[PDB]
Amino acid sequence: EEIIWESLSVDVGSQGNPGIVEYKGVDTKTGEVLFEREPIPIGTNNMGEFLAIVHGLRYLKERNSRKPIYSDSQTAIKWVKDKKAKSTLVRNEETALIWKLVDEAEEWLNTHTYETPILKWQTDKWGEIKADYG
RNA sequence: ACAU
DNA sequence: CGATGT
Ligand SMILES: [K+]
Ligand SMILES: [K+]
Ligand SMILES: [Mn+2]
Ligand SMILES: [Mn+2]
């Protein structure tokens, strides 16, 4: 219905898919960038969308914030709900780093708790998510 | 189809 | 136009 402005928005950016992956999180209300992940040489859009949500969860928990997270990724929202990133990306030497991070993110989800609502950003009604990469 |  | 996903 209405945008919850008191929230954190996250998004992936890539150069190719699979390709170089990065992500960031921004204050939905002000656009202030609150965190940015160093580019990862090879990953998928959905792995990056997933890591962005999990980093958001850790970021808000450390600061004792009950704000929700917005993501535009139907896939990544489901993966976080399941605490399982069902990526098809080949596990080999050159994907080793992204899979390490995905594996460590699942591990964090499986050893911590949170109440953070993870909400679908309704791009069709509201434009691109505020964390988008132009 | 939907979401990227 | 291709790829990642449910
Ligand atoms: K973009
Ligand atoms: K498709
Ligand atoms: Mn996105
Ligand atoms: Mn985007």
Q: Would you call the peptide bond into A18 cis, given omega within 30 degrees of 0 as the criterion?
A: yes
Bases on strand B under 7 Å from any protein CB: 2-4
Burial A18-27 (b: 16+ CB within 10 A, else e): beebbbbbbb
Query: In whole angstroms, how large is the CA radius of gyration of chain A?
Result: 14
Domain CATH number, residue A11: 3.30.420.10
A11 is in an annotated binding site: yes
> How far does residue A63's CA lie from ligand 4's centre (Å)?
25
- In units of Å, what resolution does this entry have? 1.5
Which nucleotide does the CA of A74 lie closest to, via C1'? Answer: B3
Supply the range of the domain harboring residue A105. Answer: 1-134
Tokens of A112: 């911590």
> How far does residue A40's CA lie from ligand 4's centre (Å)?
17
For strand A19-27 and strand A69-71, is the pairing parallel, antiparallel, or unpaired? Answer: unpaired
Residue A19's nearest CA partner among A117, A133, A104 is A133
Number of domains within chain A: 1
| Measured distance CA(A121)–CA(A69) in Å, rounded | 9
